Amino acid sequence: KKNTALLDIARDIGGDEAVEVVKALEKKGEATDEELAELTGVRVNTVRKILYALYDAKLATFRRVRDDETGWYYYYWRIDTKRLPEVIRTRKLQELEKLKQMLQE
């Protein structure tokens, strides 16, 4: 039930690619952008844009590692269902009162 609801939010976010990304992420526990682009075949710019969307929806978190050859960070993402129930609800309420204002036209 939370399995499918997560994936449905992913579809709204980014279609079949988002659903591939979420599924590979859950199967792997944690993953980098690059690891997810290779697991899935989706491009890394799009894996990344999906992940930052899941992060803004507070459905994903990450933890950062400093790559010491270059000094730049790279993220290890993971799905965070902790607040998924409140997210599912908020999205319903919001969609409902988007309808409410069309009725108040």
Residue numbers in the entry: 5 to 109
Q: Which sentences from the paper describe this structure?
A:
For promoter-specific transcription, RNAP and general transcription factors (GTFs) are recruited to the promoter DNA to form the pre−initiation complex (PIC). In this study, we determined the X-ray structure of TFEα and the cryo-EM structures of three forms of archaeal RNAP, including the apo-form, RNAP–TFEα binary complex, and RNAP–TFEα–DNA ternary complex.
After screening derivatives of TFEα, we found that the 13 kDa fragment Pfu TFEα (TFEαΔZRD, 1–110 amino acid residues) was crystallized. There were eight molecules in the asymmetric unit of the SAD structure and two molecules in the asymmetric unit of the native structure. The eWHD structure is similar with the X-ray crystal structures of the eWHD of Sso TFEα15 and the eWHD of human TFIIEα23. Superposition of the globular part of the eWHD from the 10 crystallographically independent structures (average root-mean-square deviation in α-carbon positions are 0.369–0.589 Å over residues 8–62) reveal flexibilities in the wing and the α5 linker. The conformation of the wing can change about 24° (~13 Å), and the α5 can be bent at ~21° (~12 Å) for the eWHD.
